[PDB]
Amino acid sequence: MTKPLILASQSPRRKELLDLLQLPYSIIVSEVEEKLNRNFSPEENVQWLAKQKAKAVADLHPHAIVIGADTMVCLDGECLGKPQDQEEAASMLRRLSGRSHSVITAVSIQAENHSETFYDKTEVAFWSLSEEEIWTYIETKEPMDKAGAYGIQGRGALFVKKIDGDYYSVMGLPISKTMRALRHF
Amino acid sequence: MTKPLILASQSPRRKELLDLLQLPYSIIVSEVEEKLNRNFSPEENVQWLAKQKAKAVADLHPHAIVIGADTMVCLDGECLGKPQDQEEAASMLRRLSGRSHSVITAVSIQAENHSETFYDKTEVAFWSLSEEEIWTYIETKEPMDKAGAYGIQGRGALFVKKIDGDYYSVMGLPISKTMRALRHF
Ligand SMILES: O=c1ccn([C@H]2C[C@H](O)[C@@H](COP(=O)(O)OP(=O)(O)OP(=O)(O)O)O2)c(=O)[nH]1
Ligand SMILES: O=c1ccn([C@H]2C[C@H](O)[C@@H](COP(=O)(O)OP(=O)(O)OP(=O)(O)O)O2)c(=O)[nH]1
Ligand SMILES: O=c1ccn([C@H]2C[C@H](O)[C@@H](COP(=O)(O)OP(=O)(O)OP(=O)(O)O)O2)c(=O)[nH]1
Ligand SMILES: O=c1ccn([C@H]2C[C@H](O)[C@@H](COP(=O)(O)OP(=O)(O)OP(=O)(O)O)O2)c(=O)[nH]1
Ligand code: NA
């Protein structure tokens, strides 16, 4: 009951989840360079990014706790970001089809006397998909807003065959863990 | 648990306190430059140093959980370091004397899937300290390697009227806060 909570994120999904906690908080973001260094692992980066996002806002609210977060879709070491065009979206899906990939979401929490950052990994298995299925879904323009060219919610759910890990993390924020780190505040 | 635990400290006090966890671990020799930037605050720099010690060892042993810590004796936003082996210890002992000062200790825990830094702050109040008392405390090398020119342990124990925080943090390691944090590693 001493410090205000801030969610450094404009992702509706991250908002939907954090409300679960039932904790009054504001939404405040400050753009930061999403530069990703090649000679660095995805886990390193996803963690570095979520760190940057939270700090840029925490530097503006020293006496606040700020939650940064970031998700990556990776398979075979490579990680697919958001599609630049409806066509790269189709390519990304063609790659995820009928197999598994990793979804890495890193969460960073900053305060002046305490800081915590960690990542959560989940394996996602896709049914084999078809052009019709791929383009129809692309129509919705959903894949266009996410990394990996797909959301696990909505029409995307039909591609996921199963996961091993945390559903909410694949959505952008692992609430169970996030809620548990906050308890140290 | 699947990661080995490592203490990146040369400190015999941090070792005795860590043993209280009855958890197997090993001790590694860290080499880092205690160069602290004057632009930053005490609470910041200390966290930063703990964070550097740990990161140095985690860098070599990426599969492990690394603990690093650092303690400071600050009086009025001014912090007293280690005497270059002169009247340094004596003079500052005349500063603390008959008043309170802050002992700030920061603990950093590194791992490739989770990192955590925080700091404990304890208020220390002394009785008025005399000349005969300080120097007699000096001979025994004791007040010349522990920042502040005193050790709450040993002879310095007599200089202390009371503390307000965690005695173990003053020794250099808030073991109770450290353990809790580890339940999440
Ligand atoms: O191409 C971009 C554009 C923005 N951002 C970052 C900057 C800022 O930290 C945040 C703003 O929200 P945005 O919707 O752009 O990104 P997100 O990753 O979808 O969600 P979040 O709000 O958590 O960043 O995203 C990037 O990393 N890359
Ligand atoms: O352009 C850069 C600079 C640094 N890094 C990474 C590697 C470097 O080792 C780390 C710096 O520390 P980080 O920001 O990961 O965490 P921190 O130690 O908690 O930050 P601070 O130095 O603000 O305490 O960030 C990058 O990816 N890109
Ligand atoms: O002027 C200096 C130079 C170095 N150091 C630090 C960083 C260096 O790595 C370490 C070497 O001695 P030691 O490790 O014994 O220091 P400590 O402060 O007792 O604890 P730790 O072992 O956790 O570093 O001390 C200082 O505190 N002051
Ligand atoms: O060389 C130094 C000396 C001290 N500090 C302290 C003060 C600072 O507030 C804190 C956190 O690091 P910083 O403020 O540099 O943030 P960053 O630029 O995000 O760090 P990084 O370069 O690791 O990404 O560590 C440094 O960072 N760098
Ligand atoms: Na924690």
- Determine contact, residues A144/A86, Cβ cutoff 8 Å: yes
* Residue B115 belongs to domain spanning: 1-185
Decide the pairing of beta strands A25-27 and A5-7.
parallel
| CATH number assigned to the domain comprising residue B58 | 3.90.950.10
- Determine contact, residues B81/B104, Cβ cutoff 8 Å: no
Angle among Cα A64, A67, A73 to the nearest 5 degrees reads 165
Domain count, chain A: 1
Task: Tell me, yes or no, if A180 comes closer than 8 A to chain B by beta carbon.
Answer: yes
**What resolution does the deposited structure have, in angstroms?**
2.7
Task: Tell me, yes or no, if A133 comes closer than 8 A to chain B by beta carbon.
Answer: no
Q: Tell me, what amino acid is at A100?
A: S
Q: By C-alpha distance, which of B128, B127, B125, B136 is closest to B170?
A: B125
Task: Tell me, yes or no, if A119 comes closer than 8 A to chain B by beta carbon.
Answer: yes
Q: Do B118 and A113 touch (CB under 8 A)?
A: yes
Angle among Cα A184, B3, B4 to the nearest 5 degrees reads 105
State the best of A46, A109, A184 to mutate against chain B, taking most chain B CBs within 10 Å: A184
Q: Tell me, what amino acid is at A67?
A: I
Q: How far apart are CA A54 and CA A29, in angstroms?
A: 8
- Determine contact, residues B51/B117, Cβ cutoff 8 Å: yes
Angle between helices B88-96 and B131-139 (to 10 degrees): 130
- Determine contact, residues B82/B102, Cβ cutoff 8 Å: no
Residue B30 neighbours by CB under 8 Å, 6+ apart: B8, B9, B10, B53, B56, B57, B68
Q: By C-alpha distance, which of B15, B38, B10 is closest to B25?
A: B15
A70 catalytically annotated:
yes
DSSP secondary structure, A56-97, as one string: HHHTT-TTSEEEEEEEEEEETTEEE---SSHHHHHHHHHHHT
Q: By C-alpha distance, which of B101, B100, B99, B102 is closest to B121?
A: B102
- Determine contact, residues B178/B67, Cβ cutoff 8 Å: yes
Q: How far apart are CA A123 and CA A92, in angstroms?
A: 17
Q: By C-alpha distance, which of B70, B46, B67 is closest to B4?
A: B67
Residue B167 neighbours by CB under 8 Å, 6+ apart: B122, B152
**What radius of gyration, in Å, describes the C-alpha atoms of chain B?**
17
Within 44-83 of A, beta carbons closer than 8 Å to B belong to: 44, 47
DSSP reduced 3-state for A53: helix
DSSP reduced 3-state for B162: strand
What's the gap in Å between B146 CA and the centre of ligand 2? 30
Q: By C-alpha distance, which of B182, B42, B132, B115 is closest to A115?
A: B115
Residue B89 neighbours by CB under 8 Å, 6+ apart: B83, B134, B138, B143, B144, B149
Residue A172 neighbours by CB under 8 Å, 6+ apart: A11, A13, A14, A17, A69, A71, A105
Q: By C-alpha distance, which of A127, A147, A22 is closest to A84?
A: A147
Using alpha carbons, list the distances in angstroms from residue B184 to A108, B72, B111, B158.
15, 27, 11, 38
Partner-chain residue, chosen from B112, B180, B184, that has the shortest CB–CB distance to A43: B112
Residue B145 neighbours by CB under 8 Å, 6+ apart: B82
